[PDB]
């Protein structure tokens, strides 16, 4: 039950290059073991054992090897893997990236010790997400509606307001017509980014349930690996072991994988595309697939991880591999941000795979599954027409395609553009969406059958 | 004489204005994002080597 | 042990044996000439050392003298007006000591000379027996007429005072303070040694609110920077680069100015080292040199590449040391693209895996860990002062394209980007700061201070930016269609936009009255150019031709507001009040 | 009976394929038809619909038994399968019975360990070849075979093997060839002289 043998302390380091320390004469080393390094000046550093071979054990310290001696340093082998102290009072506080309190606070009293790697959920007892989360944004709730227990990222870039729409969907998260415990992982963020999220959660009075984990850019990069691992094992505790609906926000997920590339390139592992490791898909999926809901529990966990694609490329290894694991994405664009749309959400590369089970008669109403496909189709044709009037001329188009011009200037300004604090309901969104389909004739709406055109298009 | 020269010029300066913009919007950006694909795929062979 | 032996040199790298108690990233001195190196791998009893200089003539058996310290800087008096390289060797002192024109590569000349005497004064209520913690202002050294070099305690140690020095002249080797701790009394001189990779500890970070008054009108009004902020500019050959750098040193609100020339050139570096000691500063009294508050990190491409990697970290540590005294430091790094080439050389030396276009995996992490050292922040200590560090880092992308693993990693971290353009310098549009691609993320912070101090300003910026974006959209159709088919409400926007581009945006740096316009003038000329724009709206919606010919003296009053000489300070606001009502007369006509 | 998964099941003689596989889609049945006993590959980026082709084939094909191998798939996509399958009934003899009675799943999600992606492929094709020998017309859907290839890259990286193009080991194309060649319409061993088939429809994730 409990490890009661005294821990051993070794002064037997034999090699240190990069972030790896090589300890010799260790007696029965253990994979994934956590250790504690005592520097010759007295500062303490932690480390995970990443390879053991006979008597040798290769550890990697989290804070870097700058100053690690050969004769005078002493490493103490904690006999167990990395387990964090998790509790119910681990909520309402702000912590650093590693494990420690920030707001002049105590350490947590540890209701139990959970392994931060967790263990995967049996797919036989994992129930499919059905109920819909109303986020108050028409580009989210109308066209790419998320469910409670859905993993769905925000595909952003540098400079775009992804943090502003991150705080917006936290204030306005509610069920479609007992609050969401938000766990927040801030990874590689600026100081003004961490002050924005701190002063937003301390503004709406939600800070009695916020679990904010902040990890700034001055903090070391190897601690960015365990930062979503600790932020998701408390959300696993609050949802599967404390019966509570949890919303997890991961940012920046690009700063996770760029920190993951540094450790892989230091271990001389095999690279994939653009220097990222070959096991990047697995490491991204061990923090993405820890979401959803299980059958015997009434709590759930939904994930909205924010990542900024480098150089606006959706074929980069960051948004491609997260697009293969998650359940559809949200694409905040740059060309819609220059036109001062506050959510600059290009809905064409946006998707929600669990949106179909979350819409319908019992969920919102009858026409949700049909107006979303028609607003998608008229935006797709009218944007290809927009690339034709820029190359030929604004006057020599087909007469139907001038309505596609009039649709797009009303789509990007009335449907998606709503303001930082306006929270439309899902019934308000479909009512605005039918107003934009009103400018089209009845027989050009091809994706809608003739039955529900009779109930909604004459109005 | 100036009427029949005016009416055949703008219908021959529309077909020149399209041939410029078809280069500027359809041909030149297609070559340039092809050339960006040559650079990153050649950098990916250098890491493999 | 105290020495190690060499046991083999295979290039820049020396695999030194008999090094059992050596640490990682520790500096040593290899050979009889004492070549400076850095311990980079440690295989048991042997350590491999990459040497910063040319290993040539190094024997097998030469003494490797370990220092026990990492790459650190000497912090104390004797640093303003000095010129260092990236590893902080005083280039002005090393030419007088050796009387040669080279760097002799075996020179351990101290960065702060121990021969000059400085007038030390105690903290005056810092009594003997008083408890003192790290970051406390311990004394004051009058280094110049401008800089009061406040001697502080290092943030590592702590104790109670047993001896303080009487006020007088001392060297940088004299013992000034003794502190008793539990075990042993520690003594130290006025100079402290601090590693360059380790961020200086500090009490708590603060949001930045006070703007930087650069003096230029396009920089102070449209795209403002704050003290404690991060700025980036393009570093091309000639647009405005040396002009913006020297205006930031001459006419800013900042107490010290450091300039990090990082691996620059052969003859571009000598242009800086000859022009900066002959600049002038306008203090309340009589004109002084800019070198009383300036410290240069001069580093050419001939110099060691591990000194060009450390030149950025040397500068920001000098930036944080004068931050802790309570000053407002502004740092200009030129350029950060030549620093990223030094990272590609060190990573290519150790055969590191190339992540993005050659550059290593930690390129975006070293850039993040440098721009995050800048900020307005309350220093450690009991006297409770406030300081700041601003960083203006030049970026030199290939071909002027802003898609690069160094450029895109920079623009995702910095908040202000003053976009200096080459073609605007071709038309002699000075300064050449483009306004389409430039931005500033520091508007909201500024928005607080401008309602306690200027009030009527913000809405003025918002509509002035609305004019310039609508001008570019209108100017496309001028060649396609013509000005005769344009509407009456639109053509009045175009003339006042041309009035902004000549009166507001264009600013001559050689025309005496324009060297350092302060603020109201900046709120002054824009309050008359947009009220004229707002009054022309209802005057058109009540003929554009009759107003253009009859306001030719009134438009001449707007086109001559930039000549309010610095013998006209309060009078300039009275002329700003009276020139507005002359517009108010001709509105009804 | 206990049969090793890395060994091809013995069988009397291979046969040419003549009857087509009716997927139910119009572009699939008309322009690019598949046979029972054939090999199919579905590449494509994310959000293209590689599981909607996989789910419509496991619901509405002409195949006697269906197996579905989730190799590095999503955890919710196998829970999606076991919900609507016990309610989708089909008619064979005038009687209605759900399609879960002919379905068997080999679930190895992306959260699960990487070396089991190799084992889940060989487990399925052994179950696929087992119901082949009874005379049934088996259809196998592997999703995704690109995650099996990423598993072989990560294992060979630990053994310090030298890589073929883009990280993958040099024996990648031999593992794929020894898996797709276990499919075919083929006369089984034994005296009652029946005939079975195995169709492999493998999703690729480039
Ligand atoms: N036949 C279809 N009809 C309507 N929508 C479809 C159809 N096929 C695919 N989709 C849409 O495509 C989305 C992605 O399907 P998916 O199988 O997950 O692609 P992939 O597996 O390659 O990521 C689905 O969520 C669904 O909304
Ligand atoms: Mg799929």
Swiss-Prot record, chain A:
Protein name: V-type proton ATPase subunit B, brain isoform
Binding, ATP: 353
Species this chain originates from: Bos taurus
Function of the protein: Non-catalytic subunit of the V1 complex of vacuolar(H+)-ATPase (V-ATPase), a multisubunit enzyme composed of a peripheral complex (V1) that hydrolyzes ATP and a membrane integral complex (V0) that translocates protons. V-ATPase is responsible for acidifying and maintaining the pH of intracellular compartments and in some cell types, is targeted to the plasma membrane, where it is responsible for acidifying the extracellular environment.
Primary localisation category: membrane
Tissues expressed in: Expressed in brain (at protein level). Expressed in all tissues tested, but highest in brain and in adrenal medulla.
Cellular component annotations (GO), alphabetically ordered: apical plasma membrane; clathrin-coated vesicle membrane; cytosol; melanosome; plasma membrane; synaptic vesicle membrane; vacuolar proton-transporting V-type ATPase, V1 domain
GO biological process: ATP metabolic process; pH reduction; proton transmembrane transport; vacuolar acidification
InterPro entries hit by this protein: ATP-synt_VA_C, ATPase_a/bsu_AS, ATPase_F1/V1/A1_a/bsu_N, ATPase_F1/V1/A1_a/bsu_nucl-bd, ATPase_V1-cplx_bsu, P-loop_NTPase, V-ATPase_su_B/beta
Gene Ontology molecular function: ATP binding; proton-transporting ATPase activity, rotational mechanism
Location(s), subcellular: Apical cell membrane; Melanosome; Cytoplasm; Cytoplasmic vesicle, Clathrin-coated vesicle membrane
Pfam family membership, one: ATP-synt_ab_N
Keyword Membrane: yes
Keywords attached to this entry: ATP-binding, Cell membrane, Cytoplasm, Cytoplasmic vesicle, Hydrogen ion transport, Ion transport, Membrane, Nucleotide-binding, Synapse, Transport
Family stated for the protein in its record: Belongs to the ATPase alpha/beta chains family.
Membrane topology, record value: Peripheral membrane protein
CDD domains from the UniProt entry: ATP-synt_V_A-type_beta_C, ATP-synt_V_A-type_beta_N, V_A-ATPase_B
Top-rank taxon: Eukaryota
From Swiss-Prot, chain C:
Modified residues (Phosphoserine): 369
Top EC category: translocase
Membrane topology reported for the UniProt record: Peripheral membrane protein
Known tissue expression: Expressed in brain (at protein level).
GO molecular-function term, one example from the UniProt record: ATP binding
HAMAP family assigned: ATP_synth_A_arch (MF_00309)
Protein name: V-type proton ATPase catalytic subunit A
Species name: Bos taurus
Source species taxonomy: Eukaryota, Metazoa, Chordata, Craniata, Vertebrata
Swiss-Prot record, chain D:
Binding site for ATP: 44-51
Modification Phosphoserine, positions: 178
Subcellular location: Cytoplasm; Cytoplasm, Cytosol; Cytoplasmic vesicle, Secretory vesicle; Cytoplasmic vesicle, Clathrin-coated vesicle membrane
Tissue: Expressed in brain (at protein level).
Posttranslational mods: Phosphorylation at Ser-178 by AMPK down-regulates its enzyme activity.
Function: Catalytic subunit of the V1 complex of vacuolar(H+)-ATPase (V-ATPase), a multisubunit enzyme composed of a peripheral complex (V1) that hydrolyzes ATP and a membrane integral complex (V0) that translocates protons. V-ATPase is responsible for acidifying and maintaining the pH of intracellular compartments and in some cell types, is targeted to the plasma membrane, where it is responsible for acidifying the extracellular environment.
Similarity remark: Belongs to the ATPase alpha/beta chains family.
SUBUNIT field: V-ATPase is a heteromultimeric enzyme made up of two complexes: the ATP-hydrolytic V1 complex and the proton translocation V0 complex. The V1 complex consists of three catalytic AB heterodimers that form a heterohexamer, three peripheral stalks each consisting of EG heterodimers, one central rotor including subunits D and F, and the regulatory subunits C and H. The proton translocation complex V0 consists of the proton transport subunit a, a ring of proteolipid subunits c9c'', rotary subunit d, subunits e and f, and the accessory subunits ATP6AP1/Ac45 and ATP6AP2/PRR.
Protein name from the UniProt record: V-type proton ATPase catalytic subunit A
Species, as recorded: Bos taurus (Bovine)
